[PDB]
Amino acid sequence: MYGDLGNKLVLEAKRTKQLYARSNQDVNLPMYHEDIIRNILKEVSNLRKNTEYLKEQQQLGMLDDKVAKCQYFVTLLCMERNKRCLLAYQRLRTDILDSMAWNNNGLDLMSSITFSQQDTNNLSHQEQEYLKEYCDLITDLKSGDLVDIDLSGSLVPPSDAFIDVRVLKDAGEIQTEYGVFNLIKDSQFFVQQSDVERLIQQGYLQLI
Template sequence: MYGDLAVKLVQDSKRTLSLDVLPSYQTDLVNAIIREIRDLQRDVKILIDQRGPNYRASQDRRVSCAIFVLQICMRRNKRCLLAYHRLRARRLETLVWSGFEASSIGSEEDSEGATALTERPSVASGWHPDEEEYLRGYGDVLAELKGEWTDIDLTGSMEPPRDLFIDVRVLKDAGEIQTEYGLITLTKNSQFYVRQGDVEQLIQQGYIQKLR
């Protein structure tokens, strides 16, 4: 029945909201919905062509109703496709703002020799090539914007901190960082009492966990 495939796509979008990573792109389902839209367009054209160029909706209410239903189905399918892709685009944008490096997609190793996809399980697994291109482009725009505002951390949390200093635990080795009070070596399972602004980005990237 028309619209059933679009319902499945919306359900997949709803499931995406509860996941920590972006799931694989539903290529087969999206293509099937596009084919359905084309079939609907073909059916509308056939109905109109059979009645000639001078056809008016008031001439045959049954045909007019059929055309109206087909057009409504097309519009609904298109809205579902737009909603699906907009949701995925926003998830990609969130990744960039959280510090994910778009250049690491497809690379075997990051700067520390660790597998890039191992650091972030399932990231970029099954993404559409256009999504990877969008992620890189969005990352370039953000990098350009950050370059103009070097004195402000645009990727920092929008929620004002309750405390200037916080207790943190290191979840994975992150090397050395320079803070206002000296050099700190972040080794896995170590704990520190540091200024939140010095480690905010590392918290977003998953290297450090803020302790309650």
């Protein structure tokens, strides 16, 4: 009853892992809960308020009682508990997030972060600032190599090395890089793994 709201919150955190697990991974997190954590923050503010109040009270009334210690001990733990929840949730949220910023940006010619992440505005803007700052953070890693990467893609090794892509209602032709593949619905291109990696992440290509 004391710290249990955090147990319920992480209990809810669990279900997003369930949605990232088997899964199938489309992202589409329901929302970030600002309300329930606001409840948590009001509860914890309550706590630390009574804490500094009693911290004033030992200075006068309690007179360093053996019992007093407990309040600064036990209730202190509760603060930690909320923290233990609040970060555990939060890191989970960053884990479901940064990976998404990994596997697709997105990809050639990124060329900008847009239309991605169906959560969009529904997810908190505090995370989105972190996010845009994070893909800005990875643009520098993109700019060191020079390898080249091409890192966001090709988690799965090339074979061999030409494939066949069957158009999937995409228009097209938007293939400007390397060559004008001239995208055309109902058209399969006997194209090398090279531009396939880049174009398959967008949603144009279908069968590898």
